[PDB]
Amino acid sequence: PFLI
């Protein structure tokens, strides 16, 4: 992902 882009972030978690």
The contacts of residue 2 (CB under 8 Å, 6+ apart) are none
Look at the block and give the residue holding tokens 């972030």. 3
Look at the block and give the residue holding tokens 């882009």. 2
DSSP character at residue 3? -
Q: Tell me the HSE value of 3 on the side-chain side, using a 13 A CA sphere.
A: 0
Preceding-residue numbers of gaps in the chain (C–N over 2.5 Å): none
Number of helices (H), then strands (E), belonging to the chain: the values are: 0, 0
Look at the block and give the residue holding tokens 């992902």. 1
Experimental method reported for this structure: X-ray
